[PDB]
Amino acid sequence: QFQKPGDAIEYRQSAFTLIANHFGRVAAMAQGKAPFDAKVAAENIALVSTLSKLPLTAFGPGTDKGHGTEAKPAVWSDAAGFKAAADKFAAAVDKLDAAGKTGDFAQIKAAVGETGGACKGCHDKFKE
Amino acid sequence: QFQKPGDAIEYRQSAFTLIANHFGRVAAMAQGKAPFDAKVAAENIALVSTLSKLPLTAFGPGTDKGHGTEAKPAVWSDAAGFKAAADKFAAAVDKLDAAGKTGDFAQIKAAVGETGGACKGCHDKFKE
Ligand code: HEC
Ligand code: HEC
């Protein structure tokens, strides 16, 4: 779906930006920085879940260069490591999605922690 | 929630990028440039619909300068005009959503044309 490799880069960056913004709204409630509203949390979680399925589809062959990319070469040269990182994130987001549907603060908070750990674990190995 | 103007600008840009990509996938089918797959068209339409509701929430006061923005000052000095352009888009996206639900190629093609017109109409007045 990307005509030029720059397109894949801008797409994945864009998806990550939207994920970070909506995930951050949920995290703010989990951290007690904003009052908890289960409906609003659920809406933001649903968006995170939808968006989470997008960026990791945009690291195809030849999408490694330029356009302000912060993807490390290891994304392509340690593809197994990158896939493990992606799968850990998908598993955490599944739990987050389930938590959003229950409206249980504790379950949401636990899943925010797991999800955030997956963001960081991938970035440590694969993002500048 | 945007902490600084840069955050609003990056968010809206990011959402428009994702919108353009998924909309373009549908458009390619409608224009007779790719085979028609109604399920895939519906999935991309549903994403467009979800996404369409995001960027126009990120043009608050003071988000008019810097950070690579291409928003024209008229976004804020003709707020009613910008809102009219946004509402025209939203109405077109409603029709695109309806078309995704039916799977009707002709209805999808009509809605792609209308939606595209709404992108262009807003850009002509409000985007550098
Ligand atoms: C690997 C499996 C990742 C997971 C899981 C998450 N992110 Fe990440 N992210 C990853 C890479 C390789 C990059 C660089 C993309 C590029 O081509 O430049 C990023 C980038 C981001 C960004 C910056 C986007 C930009 O500046 O344009 C953000 C804000 C971001 N990622 C956030 C983020 C969050 C909140 C995550 C968990 C919910 C997350 N990412 C997971 C790789 C991976
Ligand atoms: C006004 C009501 C708009 C409608 C409807 C659409 N877009 Fe637009 N778009 C608009 C503005 C004011 C801007 C500039 C945003 C900024 O702060 O820079 C944009 C930008 C884009 C972009 C570029 C994004 C980037 O990465 O910088 C794209 C790709 C884009 N818009 C596409 C697009 C499509 C496909 C639309 C219809 C489906 C559409 N936009 C509607 C204003 C408006």
mmCIF file of all heavy atoms in Angstrom, chain A residues 9 12-14 16-17 19-20 23 56 59 68-72 75 82 85-86 89 115 118-119 122-123 126-127, ligand 1, unseen atoms left out:
data_model
loop_
_atom_site.group_PDB
_atom_site.id
_atom_site.type_symbol
_atom_site.label_atom_id
_atom_site.label_comp_id
_atom_site.label_asym_id
_atom_site.label_seq_id
_atom_site.Cartn_x
_atom_site.Cartn_y
_atom_site.Cartn_z
ATOM 1 N N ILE A 9 7.381 5.179 5.775
ATOM 2 C CA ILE A 9 7.956 5.832 6.927
ATOM 3 C C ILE A 9 6.990 6.850 7.524
ATOM 4 O O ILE A 9 6.777 6.880 8.738
ATOM 5 C CB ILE A 9 9.304 6.501 6.553
ATOM 6 C CG1 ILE A 9 10.331 5.416 6.137
ATOM 7 C CG2 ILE A 9 9.771 7.317 7.721
ATOM 8 C CD1 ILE A 9 11.621 5.918 5.436
ATOM 9 N N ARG A 12 4.065 5.013 9.284
ATOM 10 C CA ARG A 12 4.290 4.390 10.581
ATOM 11 C C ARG A 12 4.537 5.453 11.651
ATOM 12 O O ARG A 12 4.045 5.330 12.783
ATOM 13 C CB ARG A 12 5.433 3.376 10.495
ATOM 14 C CG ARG A 12 6.852 3.923 10.283
ATOM 15 C CD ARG A 12 7.685 2.911 9.531
ATOM 16 N NE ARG A 12 9.104 3.310 9.527
ATOM 17 C CZ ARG A 12 9.999 2.792 8.694
ATOM 18 N NH1 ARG A 12 9.610 1.905 7.802
ATOM 19 N NH2 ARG A 12 11.292 3.121 8.752
ATOM 20 N N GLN A 13 5.277 6.507 11.318
ATOM 21 C CA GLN A 13 5.446 7.591 12.268
ATOM 22 C C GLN A 13 4.124 8.185 12.681
ATOM 23 O O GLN A 13 3.906 8.456 13.867
ATOM 24 C CB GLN A 13 6.350 8.676 11.660
ATOM 25 C CG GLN A 13 7.818 8.248 11.516
ATOM 26 C CD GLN A 13 8.661 9.205 10.706
ATOM 27 O OE1 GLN A 13 8.135 10.084 10.007
ATOM 28 N NE2 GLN A 13 9.976 9.050 10.807
ATOM 29 N N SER A 14 3.275 8.456 11.710
ATOM 30 C CA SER A 14 1.956 9.024 11.972
ATOM 31 C C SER A 14 1.144 8.108 12.879
ATOM 32 O O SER A 14 0.505 8.577 13.823
ATOM 33 C CB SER A 14 1.250 9.234 10.641
ATOM 34 O OG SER A 14 1.863 10.261 9.874
ATOM 35 N N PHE A 16 2.244 5.865 15.028
ATOM 36 C CA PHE A 16 2.825 5.914 16.370
ATOM 37 C C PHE A 16 2.474 7.191 17.109
ATOM 38 O O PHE A 16 2.218 7.133 18.294
ATOM 39 C CB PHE A 16 4.342 5.734 16.324
ATOM 40 C CG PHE A 16 4.790 4.314 16.078
ATOM 41 C CD1 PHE A 16 5.681 4.032 15.046
ATOM 42 C CD2 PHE A 16 4.337 3.263 16.837
ATOM 43 C CE1 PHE A 16 6.153 2.739 14.806
ATOM 44 C CE2 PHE A 16 4.787 1.945 16.593
ATOM 45 C CZ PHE A 16 5.709 1.701 15.559
ATOM 46 N N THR A 17 2.456 8.323 16.414
ATOM 47 C CA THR A 17 2.055 9.575 17.060
ATOM 48 C C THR A 17 0.622 9.504 17.589
ATOM 49 O O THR A 17 0.346 9.872 18.714
ATOM 50 C CB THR A 17 2.220 10.754 16.109
ATOM 51 O OG1 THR A 17 3.613 10.954 15.870
ATOM 52 C CG2 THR A 17 1.610 12.040 16.607
ATOM 53 N N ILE A 19 -1.095 6.749 18.302
ATOM 54 C CA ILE A 19 -1.098 5.772 19.376
ATOM 55 C C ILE A 19 -0.606 6.418 20.659
ATOM 56 O O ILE A 19 -1.229 6.259 21.727
ATOM 57 C CB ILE A 19 -0.218 4.556 19.004
ATOM 58 C CG1 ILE A 19 -0.870 3.739 17.890
ATOM 59 C CG2 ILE A 19 0.092 3.696 20.249
ATOM 60 C CD1 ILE A 19 0.087 2.749 17.229
ATOM 61 N N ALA A 20 0.517 7.143 20.578
ATOM 62 C CA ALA A 20 1.060 7.741 21.792
ATOM 63 C C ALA A 20 0.083 8.729 22.408
ATOM 64 O O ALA A 20 -0.064 8.780 23.635
ATOM 65 C CB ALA A 20 2.388 8.432 21.463
ATOM 66 N N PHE A 23 -2.975 6.608 23.844
ATOM 67 C CA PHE A 23 -2.494 5.818 24.956
ATOM 68 C C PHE A 23 -2.167 6.705 26.155
ATOM 69 O O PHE A 23 -2.462 6.361 27.286
ATOM 70 C CB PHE A 23 -1.287 4.975 24.542
ATOM 71 C CG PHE A 23 -0.766 4.089 25.628
ATOM 72 C CD1 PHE A 23 -1.477 3.022 26.076
ATOM 73 C CD2 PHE A 23 0.479 4.300 26.185
ATOM 74 C CE1 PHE A 23 -1.028 2.219 27.079
ATOM 75 C CE2 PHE A 23 0.948 3.487 27.192
ATOM 76 C CZ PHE A 23 0.208 2.454 27.619
ATOM 77 N N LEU A 56 3.213 -1.409 12.293
ATOM 78 C CA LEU A 56 4.164 -2.504 12.140
ATOM 79 C C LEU A 56 3.978 -3.198 10.794
ATOM 80 O O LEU A 56 4.809 -4.008 10.439
ATOM 81 C CB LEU A 56 4.155 -3.401 13.400
ATOM 82 C CG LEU A 56 4.556 -2.636 14.681
ATOM 83 C CD1 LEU A 56 4.139 -3.248 15.996
ATOM 84 C CD2 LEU A 56 6.092 -2.405 14.716
ATOM 85 N N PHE A 59 7.033 -1.487 7.799
ATOM 86 C CA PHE A 59 8.489 -1.683 7.909
ATOM 87 C C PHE A 59 8.950 -2.742 6.886
ATOM 88 O O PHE A 59 9.807 -3.578 7.181
ATOM 89 C CB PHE A 59 8.932 -2.087 9.319
ATOM 90 C CG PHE A 59 8.801 -1.015 10.363
ATOM 91 C CD1 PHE A 59 7.622 -0.864 11.079
ATOM 92 C CD2 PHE A 59 9.872 -0.196 10.672
ATOM 93 C CE1 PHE A 59 7.511 0.069 12.071
ATOM 94 C CE2 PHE A 59 9.763 0.757 11.668
ATOM 95 C CZ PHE A 59 8.549 0.899 12.360
ATOM 96 N N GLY A 68 13.593 11.307 8.121
ATOM 97 C CA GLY A 68 13.637 11.473 9.543
ATOM 98 C C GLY A 68 13.411 10.183 10.264
ATOM 99 O O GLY A 68 13.044 10.182 11.454
ATOM 100 N N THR A 69 13.636 9.080 9.558
ATOM 101 C CA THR A 69 13.391 7.855 10.187
ATOM 102 C C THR A 69 14.323 7.690 11.390
ATOM 103 O O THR A 69 15.517 8.024 11.310
ATOM 104 C CB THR A 69 13.387 6.601 9.304
ATOM 105 O OG1 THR A 69 12.925 5.490 10.098
ATOM 106 C CG2 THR A 69 14.797 6.238 8.748
ATOM 107 N N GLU A 70 13.764 7.208 12.499
ATOM 108 C CA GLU A 70 14.496 6.788 13.664
ATOM 109 C C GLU A 70 14.520 5.278 13.836
ATOM 110 O O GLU A 70 14.942 4.770 14.871
ATOM 111 C CB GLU A 70 13.895 7.460 14.909
ATOM 112 C CG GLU A 70 13.902 8.995 14.856
ATOM 113 C CD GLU A 70 13.241 9.605 16.058
ATOM 114 O OE1 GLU A 70 12.094 9.190 16.425
ATOM 115 O OE2 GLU A 70 13.863 10.518 16.635
ATOM 116 N N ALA A 71 14.109 4.534 12.808
ATOM 117 C CA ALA A 71 14.168 3.071 12.858
ATOM 118 C C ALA A 71 15.668 2.646 12.761
ATOM 119 O O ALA A 71 16.383 2.993 11.796
ATOM 120 C CB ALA A 71 13.397 2.466 11.677
ATOM 121 N N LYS A 72 16.116 1.835 13.714
ATOM 122 C CA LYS A 72 17.506 1.354 13.691
ATOM 123 C C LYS A 72 17.662 0.279 12.634
ATOM 124 O O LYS A 72 16.726 -0.433 12.297
ATOM 125 C CB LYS A 72 17.897 0.802 15.048
ATOM 126 C CG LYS A 72 18.121 1.878 16.074
ATOM 127 C CD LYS A 72 18.376 1.302 17.463
ATOM 128 N N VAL A 75 16.086 -3.231 12.943
ATOM 129 C CA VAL A 75 14.730 -3.596 12.525
ATOM 130 C C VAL A 75 14.733 -4.624 11.399
ATOM 131 O O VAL A 75 13.939 -5.568 11.412
ATOM 132 C CB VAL A 75 13.942 -2.344 12.094
ATOM 133 C CG1 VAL A 75 12.613 -2.744 11.435
ATOM 134 C CG2 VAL A 75 13.643 -1.432 13.299
ATOM 135 N N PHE A 82 12.746 -8.037 16.134
ATOM 136 C CA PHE A 82 11.708 -7.031 15.884
ATOM 137 C C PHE A 82 10.324 -7.665 15.956
ATOM 138 O O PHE A 82 9.376 -7.087 16.562
ATOM 139 C CB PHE A 82 11.913 -6.354 14.529
ATOM 140 C CG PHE A 82 11.087 -5.099 14.365
ATOM 141 C CD1 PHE A 82 11.339 -4.011 15.157
ATOM 142 C CD2 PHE A 82 10.109 -5.013 13.398
ATOM 143 C CE1 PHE A 82 10.584 -2.849 15.032
ATOM 144 C CE2 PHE A 82 9.340 -3.831 13.268
ATOM 145 C CZ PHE A 82 9.614 -2.776 14.062
ATOM 146 N N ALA A 85 9.330 -8.369 19.490
ATOM 147 C CA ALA A 85 8.910 -7.106 20.099
ATOM 148 C C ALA A 85 7.488 -6.674 19.693
ATOM 149 O O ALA A 85 6.688 -6.209 20.514
ATOM 150 C CB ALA A 85 9.941 -5.988 19.782
ATOM 151 N N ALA A 86 7.188 -6.833 18.430
ATOM 152 C CA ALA A 86 5.855 -6.552 17.883
ATOM 153 C C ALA A 86 4.800 -7.454 18.495
ATOM 154 O O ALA A 86 3.711 -6.992 18.882
ATOM 155 C CB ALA A 86 5.872 -6.725 16.359
ATOM 156 N N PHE A 89 3.997 -6.482 22.088
ATOM 157 C CA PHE A 89 3.104 -5.322 22.056
ATOM 158 C C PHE A 89 1.677 -5.760 21.716
ATOM 159 O O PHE A 89 0.718 -5.344 22.386
ATOM 160 C CB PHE A 89 3.654 -4.356 21.017
ATOM 161 C CG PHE A 89 2.793 -3.148 20.756
ATOM 162 C CD1 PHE A 89 2.422 -2.289 21.779
ATOM 163 C CD2 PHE A 89 2.350 -2.882 19.472
ATOM 164 C CE1 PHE A 89 1.651 -1.186 21.519
ATOM 165 C CE2 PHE A 89 1.592 -1.735 19.222
ATOM 166 C CZ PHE A 89 1.260 -0.906 20.245
ATOM 167 N N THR A 115 1.464 -2.652 28.456
ATOM 168 C CA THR A 115 1.560 -2.052 27.128
ATOM 169 C C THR A 115 2.743 -1.096 27.055
ATOM 170 O O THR A 115 3.560 -1.151 26.141
ATOM 171 C CB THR A 115 0.242 -1.359 26.743
ATOM 172 O OG1 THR A 115 -0.804 -2.316 26.719
ATOM 173 C CG2 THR A 115 0.329 -0.741 25.365
ATOM 174 N N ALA A 118 5.960 -2.773 26.679
ATOM 175 C CA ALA A 118 6.197 -3.246 25.314
ATOM 176 C C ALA A 118 6.663 -2.098 24.409
ATOM 177 O O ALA A 118 7.487 -2.307 23.503
ATOM 178 C CB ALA A 118 4.944 -3.906 24.786
ATOM 179 N N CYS A 119 6.125 -0.891 24.593
ATOM 180 C CA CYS A 119 6.622 0.253 23.823
ATOM 181 C C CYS A 119 8.120 0.423 24.078
ATOM 182 O O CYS A 119 8.915 0.478 23.140
ATOM 183 C CB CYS A 119 5.944 1.572 24.198
ATOM 184 S SG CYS A 119 4.160 1.615 24.396
ATOM 185 N N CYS A 122 10.600 -2.346 22.777
ATOM 186 C CA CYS A 122 10.904 -2.231 21.356
ATOM 187 C C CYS A 122 11.817 -1.044 21.123
ATOM 188 O O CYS A 122 12.835 -1.165 20.439
ATOM 189 C CB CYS A 122 9.654 -2.088 20.504
ATOM 190 S SG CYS A 122 10.126 -2.131 18.797
ATOM 191 N N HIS A 123 11.522 0.105 21.704
ATOM 192 C CA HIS A 123 12.335 1.291 21.435
ATOM 193 C C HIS A 123 13.791 1.112 21.844
ATOM 194 O O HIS A 123 14.728 1.549 21.126
ATOM 195 C CB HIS A 123 11.790 2.506 22.169
ATOM 196 C CG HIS A 123 10.508 2.998 21.577
ATOM 197 N ND1 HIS A 123 9.860 4.095 22.065
ATOM 198 C CD2 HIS A 123 9.809 2.575 20.500
ATOM 199 C CE1 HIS A 123 8.758 4.303 21.347
ATOM 200 N NE2 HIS A 123 8.688 3.386 20.396
ATOM 201 N N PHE A 126 15.287 -0.958 18.994
ATOM 202 C CA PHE A 126 14.986 -0.666 17.592
ATOM 203 C C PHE A 126 14.707 0.785 17.174
ATOM 204 O O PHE A 126 14.531 1.061 15.981
ATOM 205 C CB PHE A 126 13.814 -1.540 17.124
ATOM 206 C CG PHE A 126 14.064 -2.979 17.271
ATOM 207 C CD1 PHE A 126 13.487 -3.742 18.280
ATOM 208 C CD2 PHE A 126 14.938 -3.619 16.380
ATOM 209 C CE1 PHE A 126 13.745 -5.101 18.378
ATOM 210 C CE2 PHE A 126 15.215 -4.960 16.500
ATOM 211 C CZ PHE A 126 14.646 -5.703 17.500
ATOM 212 N N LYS A 127 14.633 1.711 18.121
ATOM 213 C CA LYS A 127 14.393 3.112 17.808
ATOM 214 C C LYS A 127 15.555 3.975 18.335
ATOM 215 O O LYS A 127 15.986 3.847 19.490
ATOM 216 C CB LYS A 127 13.076 3.594 18.426
ATOM 217 C CG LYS A 127 12.730 4.991 18.078
ATOM 218 C CD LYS A 127 11.508 5.451 18.868
ATOM 219 C CE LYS A 127 11.173 6.898 18.605
ATOM 220 N NZ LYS A 127 12.181 7.846 19.216
HETATM 221 C C1 HEC C 1 8.401 -2.176 17.897
HETATM 222 C C2 HEC C 1 7.805 -3.426 17.910
HETATM 223 C C3 HEC C 1 7.648 -0.938 18.480
HETATM 224 C C4 HEC C 1 6.647 -0.913 19.393
HETATM 225 C C5 HEC C 1 5.953 -2.086 20.087
HETATM 226 C C6 HEC C 1 6.290 0.473 19.572
HETATM 227 N N1 HEC C 1 7.086 1.312 18.803
HETATM 228 FE FE1 HEC C 1 7.180 3.288 18.852
HETATM 229 N N2 HEC C 1 8.451 3.235 17.236
HETATM 230 C C7 HEC C 1 9.111 2.092 16.781
HETATM 231 C C8 HEC C 1 10.042 2.462 15.739
HETATM 232 C C9 HEC C 1 10.972 1.535 14.983
HETATM 233 C C10 HEC C 1 9.898 3.898 15.568
HETATM 234 C C11 HEC C 1 10.590 4.773 14.562
HETATM 235 C C12 HEC C 1 9.698 4.890 13.314
HETATM 236 C C13 HEC C 1 10.416 5.705 12.247
HETATM 237 O O1 HEC C 1 10.412 5.259 11.076
HETATM 238 O O2 HEC C 1 10.944 6.834 12.555
HETATM 239 C C14 HEC C 1 8.889 4.337 16.523
HETATM 240 C C15 HEC C 1 8.470 5.628 16.695
HETATM 241 C C16 HEC C 1 7.603 6.086 17.660
HETATM 242 C C17 HEC C 1 7.235 7.460 17.880
HETATM 243 C C18 HEC C 1 7.762 8.654 17.091
HETATM 244 C C19 HEC C 1 6.934 8.922 15.858
HETATM 245 C C20 HEC C 1 7.444 10.247 15.211
HETATM 246 O O3 HEC C 1 8.241 11.031 15.815
HETATM 247 O O4 HEC C 1 7.109 10.610 14.040
HETATM 248 C C21 HEC C 1 6.367 7.478 18.908
HETATM 249 C C22 HEC C 1 5.634 8.673 19.519
HETATM 250 C C23 HEC C 1 6.167 6.103 19.329
HETATM 251 N N3 HEC C 1 6.947 5.261 18.558
HETATM 252 C C24 HEC C 1 5.360 5.687 20.371
HETATM 253 C C25 HEC C 1 5.104 4.391 20.733
HETATM 254 C C26 HEC C 1 4.193 4.000 21.782
HETATM 255 C C27 HEC C 1 3.444 4.945 22.736
HETATM 256 C C28 HEC C 1 4.158 2.662 21.798
HETATM 257 C C29 HEC C 1 3.337 1.750 22.696
HETATM 258 C C30 HEC C 1 1.967 2.054 22.957
HETATM 259 C C31 HEC C 1 5.025 2.174 20.752
HETATM 260 N N4 HEC C 1 5.571 3.264 20.135
HETATM 261 C C32 HEC C 1 5.306 0.883 20.447
HETATM 262 C C33 HEC C 1 8.909 0.831 17.225
HETATM 263 C C34 HEC C 1 7.961 0.444 18.125
#
